[PDB]
Amino acid sequence: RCVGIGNRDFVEGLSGATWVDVVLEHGSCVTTMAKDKPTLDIELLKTEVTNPAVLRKLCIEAKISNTTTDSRCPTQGEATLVEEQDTNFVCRRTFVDRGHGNGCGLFGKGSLITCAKFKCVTKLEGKIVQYENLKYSVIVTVHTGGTIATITPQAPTSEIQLTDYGALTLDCSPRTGLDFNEMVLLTMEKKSWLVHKQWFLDLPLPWTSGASTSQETWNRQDLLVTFKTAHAKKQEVVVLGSQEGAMHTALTGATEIQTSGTTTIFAGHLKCRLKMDKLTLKGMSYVMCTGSFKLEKEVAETQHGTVLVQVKYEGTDAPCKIPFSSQDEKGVTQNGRLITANPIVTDKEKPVNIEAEPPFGESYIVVGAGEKALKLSWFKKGSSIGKMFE
Amino acid sequence: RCVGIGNRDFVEGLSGATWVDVVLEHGSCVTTMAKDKPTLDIELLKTEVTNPAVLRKLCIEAKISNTTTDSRCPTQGEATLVEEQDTNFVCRRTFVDRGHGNGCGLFGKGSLITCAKFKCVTKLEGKIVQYENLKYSVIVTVHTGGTIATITPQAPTSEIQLTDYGALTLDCSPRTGLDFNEMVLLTMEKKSWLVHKQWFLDLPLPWTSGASTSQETWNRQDLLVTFKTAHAKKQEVVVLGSQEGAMHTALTGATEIQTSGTTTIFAGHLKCRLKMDKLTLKGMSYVMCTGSFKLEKEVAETQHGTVLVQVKYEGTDAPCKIPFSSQDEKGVTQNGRLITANPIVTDKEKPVNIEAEPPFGESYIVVGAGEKALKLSWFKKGSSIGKMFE
Amino acid sequence: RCVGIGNRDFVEGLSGATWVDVVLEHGSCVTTMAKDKPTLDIELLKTEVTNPAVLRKLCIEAKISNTTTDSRCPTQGEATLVEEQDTNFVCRRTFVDRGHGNGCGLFGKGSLITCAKFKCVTKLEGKIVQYENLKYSVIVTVHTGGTIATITPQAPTSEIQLTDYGALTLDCSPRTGLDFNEMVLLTMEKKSWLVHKQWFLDLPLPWTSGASTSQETWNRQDLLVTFKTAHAKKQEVVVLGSQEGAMHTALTGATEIQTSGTTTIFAGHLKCRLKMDKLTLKGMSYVMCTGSFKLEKEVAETQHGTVLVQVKYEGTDAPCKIPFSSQDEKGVTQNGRLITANPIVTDKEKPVNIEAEPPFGESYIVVGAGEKALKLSWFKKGSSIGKMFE
Numbered sequence A, B, C: 001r002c003v004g005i006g007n008r009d010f011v012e013g014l015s016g017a018t019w020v021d022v023v024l025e026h027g028s029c030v031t032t033m034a035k036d037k038p039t040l041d042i043e044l045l046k047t048e049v050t051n052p053a054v055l056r057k058l059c060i061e062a063k064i065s066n067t068t069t070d071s072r073c074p075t076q077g078e079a080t081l082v083e084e085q086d087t088n089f090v091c092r093r094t095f096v097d098r099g100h101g102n103g104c105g106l107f108g109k110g111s112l113i114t115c116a117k118f119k120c121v122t123k124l125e126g127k128i129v130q131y132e133n134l135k136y137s138v139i140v141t142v143h144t145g146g147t148i149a150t151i152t153p154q155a156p157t158s159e160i161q162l163t164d165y166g167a168l169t170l171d172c173s174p175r176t177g178l179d180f181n182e183m184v185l186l187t188m189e190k191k192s193w194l195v196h197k198q199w200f201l202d203l204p205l206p207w208t209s210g211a212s213t214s215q216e217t218w219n220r221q222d223l224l225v226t227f228k229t230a231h232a233k234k235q236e237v238v239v240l241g242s243q244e245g246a247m248h249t250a251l252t253g254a255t256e257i258q259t260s261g262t263t264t265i266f267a268g269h270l271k272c273r274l275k276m277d278k279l280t281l282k283g284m285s286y287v288m289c290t291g292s293f294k295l296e297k298e299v300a301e302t303q304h305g306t307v308l309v310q311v312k313y314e315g316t317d318a319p320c321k322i323p324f325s326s327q328d329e330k331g332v333t334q335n336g337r338l339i340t341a342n343p344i345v346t347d348k349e350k351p352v353n354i355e356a357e358p359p360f361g362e363s364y365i366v367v368g369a370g371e372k373a374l375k376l377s378w379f380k381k382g383s384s385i386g387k388m389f390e
C-alpha cells in the first residue's frame, strides 16, 4: 500500500546525516528501508482547522420592534426621539403633510422622525484561517510488526525516537494549494464553504466586526429594513425576509466543507524532510506501467485550478509508475502540471488518485502510454471570485 | 553564455542522489557537467500570468439617461417613481418651492423625486493573481549538439528524461520579490499596471464586485453624477466627464506591464532543486574579476525596493566573479543585499545585469575591487502604496 | 553559550559541498567545528522593520472652524454656500421653521445649509510590512580568538569569506510566526502595536488613504462632528473629544512594540542553510537532561498562538537536551508543538527560553523527565481579531 522512496529522493552524507524528501497526501503513504532494518512507513492521517477568528458577522434575517414616531406641526420645529442616540435603533427623518385634519393650525410640512429596534435573528460568519489554526497529524510506523507526530505551520518540526532507526526529525510544510490569505471560511446555519475574501467583504448585508464586544452593533441595517410611507403621526417600518435562500444560490459552486464545532477537516498535503543519522537506504525503483487504465469515476474539479482523476489499472506489471501527460489545445506536451508526487500503482486492485493542473482553456489529459492511452479533453475557465449575491 | 555551477551548490550522496541548487533568472542560464557526460544547461524562458480573477470593476466614464421627475403640490404628499426600485437608476429626493405660479393652491414646499438611468461607458478592472494564474517555462538542454518544463506554484515539480543523465527532477519555486498578495493587476483601456491592493480598493469611483452576474449594478454612482438645482416640475441630472486622465496621473510611478488578452508576461525568478541519480558533477570556480566596469545604462529602480544595475567589464580575466558591495550612508559594508545569484562575467562583450536591495536612505553601490571600483551614491525613499487619486 | 550542531543537521557530500541546517533565534547562538579548524559560531543580532508604507491614517481628535450658514425664507428657494464644493468642509442641509419673527412673509419651512471646516488635530497611522521593509543582521565568528551579514526576504543569501573555512554561503529565511499579511503596525502618538488588518480597516473613525498627496482629505468626518439643532439663520457645529482613550482601551491585549523613528525592532527567528566546501564537521550530541527545572518566570502568551517558557535547570549533567512534552486536555502526548529548535541547557546557570504552541482549550506543558518533571496546565482561547472599538 505504500509507495517506496526512490534513490533520487535521498542523500546519505559521507559524513553527517541521511536526508530524505517525502510528500504526504491524504490516502497515500510512503515507505523506505535501511541496510538490514525494519520497513519504515509515514502517512498523513488528518488535517484540521480549529477555532478560526471571525472577520465579520453578517445578518441574513432581521427583526423589527419598538417602532416609535415623533411628529410635529409645521410651526413646531424638528421632531426628536431619544432612541436617535441608540445604536440598537434604526431611524429615519422626513417631512409629512400636516393640517387641520391632524391637529395643526396650518397646512404645510411637519417634521417627523421614526425609530425602530433592529435585531438579527439569523446571521452568518466569515472566518480567517491563520497559522495557529492549522494542524496535521502524521503517523510514523516501524515494522517490527506507531507514533503520531503533530505538525503545525509555526512548529513544523517533530523529533521522534524509533526502534532501530534512532532519532528521526520530521520537518514538514504545507504544499502549495489552498491559500488561506485569499479564501475565507463561511458558516451559515450548519453548513460551511470556502469563499473568496473580497467576495465576502463586499456582500451587501448588514454586518458587524468580528472584534470582541458586549454590545452587538450592526452597520448598514438599511439593507434589510424598509420604512413605509409616513402618515401624520405614524409610520410603519418593515423588514426583508430571510436571505438564506439568496445566499445559498450565490454560494453555488463554492466548495462546501465539513465542520463539527470549531474544527474543520481538510484533505491536506505535506512536503517533508526526514533527517536521520547517516544510513544507507534502499531506494525503490518503478518501471512505467505498460497496460491500460479505466476511469473509476468522473474527473472532478477543484475551485483553485486543479482536477482530480481517479483511475484503475488493467495491466500486469504493478507496482509501476503511471505515465501521465497534459497537452494544450494544440497538442503541446507540457512536461509538468502533474501535482501528485507519487503517481504509482502499488496495487492493481486499488484505484489511484491523480491531481493535475490543466492549462486554461481547452487541453487534453493523458494517462498510460501508447495507443493503450486514455485521452480526455478538458476545458478550464478563467478564475473568478464567485457569483454575485442578488 | 551559461554560468557554471559551483561545488558549494551540490552534494553527491555517498548513497542516494546528487542534489543541486540553481537560481534561474530571465536572461541568465546555468550549466554543469558530470563525470564524462555532455554539458547540461537550464534556463527560464518565460513567466506568465494568465486569466486572473476580477476583484472589482470601477467606472471612469458614466452616462445618464431616462431622467424622470415626479413633483407634488405642498398638500399632495410624497412624490414617487417606480424607478426608485430600479438599480439601474440613481435617484434623489428633495422639497422645492411650489405655489400659484406652478399649479399649486398654496405657497410652500412640495415633494420632488428625480431618477436617472446610470450607464458605465468606460471602466477599469483590478485583478488578483492567485497560484493557479502563474506559470514558468523552463528549458533544459543536453549538449549532444531541449525539453521545456512547465512549472507552477501548485505543480512545482517536473520529472524529465535526459540523454546520458537519466531521470532528472526539477523542483522549482518563485523567488521572493513581487508579492501578489499585496499587488493588484490594474487594466484600463489597453495598458496595465501593478498597483497596491488597498490603494485600489479605496479609490473613489463607482464600483462593482468582480463576482459573476447577469445584471451589472454599480455602487457609489453619486461619485460621477450631479443632480442640478431642482425646479417645480423638473430637474437636470448631469455626469462628470471621463476620469481616464485623473487615473493616468494617479498611476504615475506605478509599474506598467505588458498584457495580450488574458496573459501578462513578467520577468520571473526561480530557485530550483535538481535531483538526479548519484553522480559526480564538475563544479565550476570563478576568480574575482580584477579589471574595471562601466555602466552600460542608468541605474533603474523597481517599485518593491530593488535597483537594477547593468555593467560592462573592461578587464582581461573573464569568466570571473563580479565584486559587489553596498555601504550605508556611513560607509558600513553590509555583507548582503545582493539579489542576483550568479554575478558572473561569462563574456567580456556581454553586459551583466545585477539586482540589489539598498538600505533605505543614502547609501553607496560598489562594483569592482580596489581603486578601479565604480562607486555610485543612491537614495532610497520609504515605502508608499501609491499616489492619491484626486 | 552556543548550541553545537548535531550530525543530523548536516551532510558532507561524497562530492560537492557540505550543507548545514541551522535555526537562529534571538538570544541563542549556534556552533560547529570542522576537522582540525577553529570553532564557528553564528548568531542573529537583530531584526528590524524600517519605513513601512501607510495603509490609511485615522483621525482621533478633530477640530471645527469657519462655520457658515445660509438660510432662506420659505418662498426663496434652496440655500447654498460655495464651501459646499470644498473638501475641507463638512456640510449639512435641512429645513427650519421661518416666519414673521425671523424676517419671512410666510410661516413655513425655509431651506438651510451649514458648512464647517474640519481639521484633524491628532491622528493615528496603520502601516503594512512588506518584504522590502524587513532586515536581519547575522553575525558569523571564526574563533581564531566577526562578520555581520545582512539578510532580507528578497536578498536571502550572503556569501562570506572566512579564515580557514573559506567561502561560506548563508541562505536564510524567516521562520513561520508573525504574519505581516494579516498584522498591521499601528502607531498612535508615540506607542505602537501589532493589530489585525480588518480590525483596523473597519475602525469607525474618519480616515484617509495612505496614498501620496498634497491635500489631506478625510472620509467619514461625520464620525467626529455633531451639527446641533438649527435655528432660523444659524446652527452650531460641534466636535467629539479625543478618542485616544477609547483607542487605548480597544487596543487592550494587542502586542505593543518598540519603534524609534521609522525603525521597529522585533525578536526575529531565522531558518538557515549554510553551504561550504566539502568538509567533515564535528557533530555535537547531547544527552537528555536528567535533573529538575524551575520556572524562572511566569509563562508568557503571544498573540499568535504560542507561549514562552523560561526555565532554570537544577541538575548536574549540562550541557544536555531538555525533555519537553505537550498533552491535550486528556493526557495525549502530541509528539510536536515544540517551536524552539535548540532546547538545550548549555549552561546550568543560564535560564533557557522555550517557545511552544499548545492545542486550543485545556492542555499540559511538561519539561523534564519522570517524577522530577514540571507539570503546568494551560488554557488556550480560540483566535480573535481584537476587541471592539466603542
Ligand SMILES: *[C@H]1O[C@H](CO)[C@@H](O)[C@H](O)[C@H]1NC(C)=O
Pocket: A066
Ligand atoms: C419596548 O419593547 C418592549 C415592549 O414590547 C419593552 O418591554 C421594552 O423595554 C422596550 N424596549 C425599548 C428599548 O424600547
Ligand SMILES: *[C@H]1O[C@H](CO)[C@@H](O)[C@H](O)[C@H]1NC(C)=O
Pocket: B066
Ligand atoms: C427610456 O429610454 C428609452 C428612450 O430613449 C426607452 O426606449 C426605454 O425603453 C426607456 N428606458 C427606461 C428603463 O426608462
Ligand SMILES: *[C@H]1O[C@H](CO)[C@@H](O)[C@H](O)[C@H]1NC(C)=O
Pocket: C066
Ligand atoms: C476663515 O477662517 C479664518 C478666520 O478665523 C480666515 O482667516 C480664513 O481665511 C477663513 N478660512 C476659510 C477657508 O473660510
Ligand SMILES: [Cl-]
Pocket: A098, A099, A100, A101, A102
Ligand atoms: Cl389635513
Ligand SMILES: [Cl-]
Pocket: B098, B099, B100, B101, B102
Ligand atoms: Cl409660484
Ligand SMILES: [Cl-]
Pocket: C098, C099, C100, C101, C102
Ligand atoms: Cl416666527
